Write a protein that binds this ligand. Sequence first.
Ligand SMILES: [Ca+2]
Ligand SMILES: [Ca+2]
Lengths: 227, 225
Amino acid sequence: SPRVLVVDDDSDVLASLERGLRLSGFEVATAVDGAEALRSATENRPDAIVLDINMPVLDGVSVVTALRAMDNDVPVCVLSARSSVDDRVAGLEAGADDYLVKPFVLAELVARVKALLRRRGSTATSSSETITVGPLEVDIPGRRARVNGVDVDLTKREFDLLAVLAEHKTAVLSRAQLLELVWGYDFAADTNVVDVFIGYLRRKLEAGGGPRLLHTVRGVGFVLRMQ
Amino acid sequence: SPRVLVVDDDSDVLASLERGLRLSGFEVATAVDGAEALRSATENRPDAIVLDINMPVLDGVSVVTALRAMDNDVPVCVLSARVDDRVAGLEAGADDYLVKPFVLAELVARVKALLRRRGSTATSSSETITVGPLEVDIPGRRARVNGVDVDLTKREFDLLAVLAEHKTAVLSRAQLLELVWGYDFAADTNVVDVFIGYLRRKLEAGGGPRLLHTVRGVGFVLRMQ
Ligand SMILES: [Ca+2]
Ligand SMILES: [Ca+2]
């Protein structure tokens, strides 16, 4: 009953993923390149999209870029070959919500797709008032972050992360807690998605040129706090 | 401003490159050896790296090797020497080179070219291109000859990919410099001819037929026969 659009230009992989997800309980639509992805996404509006990065015609990065420019927040998990790192990172930066490296076992994708759906248009936060951490203001309801009055341009998943960290300002959250609260994971994962997104957030928070607000507590977790 | 990391163990040269590139409109990071180069590259994600070859602690060839081994496709222009007539940094995976001594205008032109290429979002509609025994998987950035992987550096593939996309077309040195290297300017560099050599040698390793042809005074063509 959730509709998942799966996009890959490798016809074996696409057929396999189609088979795998349909059997796992999803209504599945497919596309072979990013143009067909955007057509499919536009004409059918999937609940989630599984999106290969390196494709002809329009790549996965472009597809993501395009969706997000249209304010289309559909959850997206990008797929990439192992070696195609600085590149899957591009999809995440451009606005994908999660990634999975090939080859993967099908359970890894199903689990992340159910998480994607659990956390589509998101946060597990109750704050209504804007949250201040030094010069940073995190407006959860208005989905707006500002540092010294200047908006910080964040993707939907960067913002969800910052929002969870602001909701628990000054508290340390572990990778595992952040996978559950932000990504909606209900399973143990081998993933550095939290680390990658902490990198992006911190770079954005610091681009102005002042204090580190977002701290890595080695072996324990991450914390948003002034000083 | 594009961020360029410059790496040279000679502090005079390092300082001079830094000054020059900054006055040319670049945001410049520096590193004194290959170890500092790796740290800077990780901590600071430069848009391009100007990389000396002979350095203590860790050399330019080792830097390029480590970067490529770690799937970091950052543009690298190596500052290298030229005997063997080999340019070891290129073979290791650097994208272009300059031979010291050089004028700054040559480095600036080459760094802009690096950046032009890395900045390109042009996406081909081609999938796998077949030329006789050779298959070029464009989107997958893989080549195989008679089903056997040909291990190519990023820039070797870039060149192979342009030749395959225009398969059987003769592309001049000038067009490949523009198309593959991102040059917008004159350049008397031999970099295209050097990489053609690399590809031939790699493509022809399995004993097979010549697929990459040099038409002197005209250009280069990838075709079976
Ligand atoms: Ca692909
Ligand atoms: Ca040196």
